[PDB]
Ligand binder design. Structure first.
Ligand code: DDH
Length: 291
């Protein structure tokens, strides 16, 4: 399986920048979502989810094909709740019908992070919609009630190392868990719609208590009213993970750099970019454009 990136016929950066701006303006506008958290978080998760089905062994899954659009994938239990992100993007697609789905879903994640003050994430266009037949089976996304070994092992299927895994998890600073969706309830911190290294700080600074939730699943709860999943918690249980956690807890700048590289890598896994492909684009935020 080779997936070669193919730029949408006749589109350029400017064309992409417009899609980014539309998503961004909509984020600004639909602020009531999830008790005022906004759609930022859910969009980041959607980009991560359409990309985490990848399997470096046979190259199936990943963001290329926009398969989330198909029922099999759309209805995946690990995908519960993502439908709101989809519905959010729907009108955007309508406005820019020449964009491929994989490109739109991935770009929403990038837009979200950057509009939430995170770092700039270089992005590449070229993903091609593939047939229903290419939809990966459910079951490729990770479980939350496990430990560091599980996590390490899991991430390897996506080619990510320790550092990448820790960086990537800092996305947990965003949004929250919802009982109805995953069987977990509560946010990971306080500034849940602003991109910061809060996640590491919390994991190292709170006094966490293991308890069972209303869905009968365990979670680490803090006095502050925050929570951590077993997998999140495992980052302080593993020696190697822990020191990276501390490093991020100490230098937000490091964290942003590392996050940036990993997220792009994550969204580009499984895709082959020809020599003549344009370089990655770095989009301007609304603010940088005075919009
Ligand atoms: C072991 C892991 O790999 C993993 C597990 C397991 C795991 C399980 C959960 C669960 C459970 C939920 C809550 C769902 C709900 O009830 O609504 C959930 C919420 C959010 N994810 Fe996550 N995630 C892990 C990795 C990543 C990564 C890498 C990312 C990333 C890089 O994007 C990222 C981004 C975000 C975001 C943001 C949310 C909050 C969504 C929301 O708020 O609606 N997560 N994640």
């Amino acid at each position: 399986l080779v997936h070669v990136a193919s730029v949408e016929k006749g589109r350029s950066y400017e064309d992409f920048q417009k899609v980014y701006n539309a998503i961004a303006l909509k984020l600004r506008e639909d602020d009531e979502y999830d008790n005022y958290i906004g759609y930022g978080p859910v969009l980041v998760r959607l980009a991560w989810h359409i990309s985490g089905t990848w399997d470096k062994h046979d190259n199936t899954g990943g963001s290329y094909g926009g398969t989330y659009r198909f029922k099999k994938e759309f209805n995946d239990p690990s995908n519960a709740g993502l439908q709101n992100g989809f519905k959010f993007l729907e009108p955007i697609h309508k406005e820019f019908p020449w964009i491929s789905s994989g490109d739109l879903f991935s770009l929403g994640g990038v837009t979200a992070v950057q509009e939430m003050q995170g770092p700039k994430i270089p992005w590449r266009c070229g993903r091609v919609d593939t047939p229903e037949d290419t939809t990966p089976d459910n079951g490729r996304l990770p479980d939350a009630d496990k430990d560091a070994g599980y996590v390490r092992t899991f991430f390897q299927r996506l080619n990510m190392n320790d550092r990448e895994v820790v960086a990537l998890m800092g996305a947990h600073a965003l949004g929250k868990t919802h009982l109805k969706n995953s069987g977990y309830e509560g946010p990971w911190g306080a500034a849940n719609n602003v991109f910061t290294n809060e996640f590491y700080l919390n994991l190292l600074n709170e006094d966490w208590k293991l308890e069972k939730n209303d869905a009968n699943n365990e979670q680490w709860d803090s006095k502050s009213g925050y929570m951590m999943l077993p997998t999140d918690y495992s980052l302080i249980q593993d020696p190697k993970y822990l020191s990276i956690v501390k490093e991020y807890a100490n230098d937000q700048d490091k964290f942003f750099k590392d996050f940036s590289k990993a997220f792009e890598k994550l969204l580009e896994d499984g895709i082959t970019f020809p020599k003549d492909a344009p370089s990655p684009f770095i989009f301007k935020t609304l603010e940088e454009q005075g919009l």
